[PDB]
Design a protein around this motif. Sequence first.
Motif, mmCIF file in Angstrom:
data_model
loop_
_atom_site.group_PDB
_atom_site.id
_atom_site.type_symbol
_atom_site.label_atom_id
_atom_site.label_comp_id
_atom_site.label_asym_id
_atom_site.label_seq_id
_atom_site.Cartn_x
_atom_site.Cartn_y
_atom_site.Cartn_z
ATOM 1 N N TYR A 81 0.848 -1.177 0.000
ATOM 2 C CA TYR A 81 0.000 0.000 0.000
ATOM 3 C C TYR A 81 0.885 1.229 0.000
ATOM 4 C CZ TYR A 81 -4.118 -2.888 0.641
ATOM 5 O OH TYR A 81 -5.141 -3.801 0.446
ATOM 6 N N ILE A 82 0.687 2.111 -0.978
ATOM 7 C CA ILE A 82 1.519 3.294 -1.153
ATOM 8 C C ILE A 82 0.706 4.554 -0.904
ATOM 9 C CG2 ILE A 82 2.764 4.692 -2.799
ATOM 10 C CD1 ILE A 82 3.686 2.136 -4.049
ATOM 11 N N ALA A 93 5.226 3.384 2.362
ATOM 12 C CA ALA A 93 4.515 2.128 2.203
ATOM 13 C C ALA A 93 4.746 1.299 3.453
ATOM 14 C CB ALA A 93 4.980 1.362 0.951
ATOM 15 N N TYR A 130 -2.095 0.671 -4.529
ATOM 16 C CA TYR A 130 -1.238 -0.400 -4.060
ATOM 17 C C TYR A 130 -0.540 -1.046 -5.240
ATOM 18 C CZ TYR A 130 -5.230 -3.416 -5.260
ATOM 19 O OH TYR A 130 -6.296 -4.025 -5.886
#
Length: 503
Positions: A81-82, A93, A130
């Motif tokens: 997940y960014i 992340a 993501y």
Amino acid sequence: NDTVVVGSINFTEQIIVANMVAEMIEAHTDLKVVRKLNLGGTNVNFEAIKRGGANNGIDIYVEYTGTGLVDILGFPEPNVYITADKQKNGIKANFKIRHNVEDGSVQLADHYQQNTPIGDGPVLLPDNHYLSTQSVLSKDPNEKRDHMVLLEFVTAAGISMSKGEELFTGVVPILVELDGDVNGHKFSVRGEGEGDATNGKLTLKFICTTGKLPVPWPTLVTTLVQCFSRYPDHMKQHDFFKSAMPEGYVQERTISFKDDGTYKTRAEVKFEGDTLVNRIELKGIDFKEDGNILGHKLEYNFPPPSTDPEGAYETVKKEYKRKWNIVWLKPLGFNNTYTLAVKDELAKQYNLKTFSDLAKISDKLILGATMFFLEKPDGYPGLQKLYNFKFKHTKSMDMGIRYTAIDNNEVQVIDAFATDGLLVSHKLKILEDDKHFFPPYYAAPIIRQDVLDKHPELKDVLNKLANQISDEEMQKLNYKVDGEGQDPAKVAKEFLKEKGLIL
């Protein structure tokens, strides 16, 4: 001996079906059934079944296909997940890696990542999305050195190109160099290969150039170039990695190995000539010398899994058998997924039926959902972005506040388990996850192989419940307990009697 232990967690539906499983064994075998409650989530049943009835654990319980997949087994490579990190002009992340251990256990690696451009210029700062990654690890049979062949496919999701991205339009050569230290044991890795970002494909071979690697190769995978991720056409303004090119970016990570040491990593990813280079320093501290990492107790390959009902069922079946020796029997018949519900008057008035039908209506209040549901990245947030829910407000009601609000039309949509007994007393309809955001949660009985060995009749006995409990039935039974306050043990009995399944 002659005794079998049936476990349940402290959850109404679980208590009902576990009472059913116990009654069936009592009705169709001569065994003593011990009914044992566990407190926690469905992971505590799993630790109890690994102990076994002999060791104040359990022998049998009802598990959900999706639960065995997501936890207990776990995705080995989940979505990275960014999020944008304004203060570093970059991104952050967080994610978990699951490494299989030779004894059947799982070794969690918590990754905390930060990225900062090396150059001073503008770069893309993405909305939350993501990366989906699949890594395949292989050996080169002719290579004498400690090494790892790696294949990686990475795609961005969760939602016309930077100048930086113009540098990735073909096949790009890659050089990876790592200098490492773990509890004092120094080592170096060098890797070379190529990356094809239009296809999100990495092809690399890594060798340890200082002898035998002192850590297992799968723990270095995340450390040893997310600029080769494939960003779909409609997401290319969310690709920080390529936009920082050619000057590149610094990547930093803390990787904590649960109940063991941690990796501290600093990398520079940038072009040199026409090679994309990843130069890493890694330092590992406080590893147990007999632990999984320094003891080389991790399996070499990541696993692959399927999110459709049958593939998920077959996957938990195979892996629960291969690891821990546990047998999945047939499903009871209902899927207890998480869902959204509205008043049934509202559902027929607007002809609702599905999540998409709901999403089209933005003049709705979804503040009746639980905080956890609103906060989980794969709870409401992911759902909002897959369906583009345009809800008016989103306050986070817990306890039973959610139900009493939809009762008064302070709120119009709430979250709920699909079989929630309170859906019937509050006269709400569940909606179909037509785009299949959630995995399937088919309940099925689970039994230790050694108990099955000792008492083979249990397989046929427990499969007499196969497809004997529909969603509507489990709802009506959950209602009788949570709505009407009946004893769950009597509720299980009456249902089985009415079906002629017991005396």
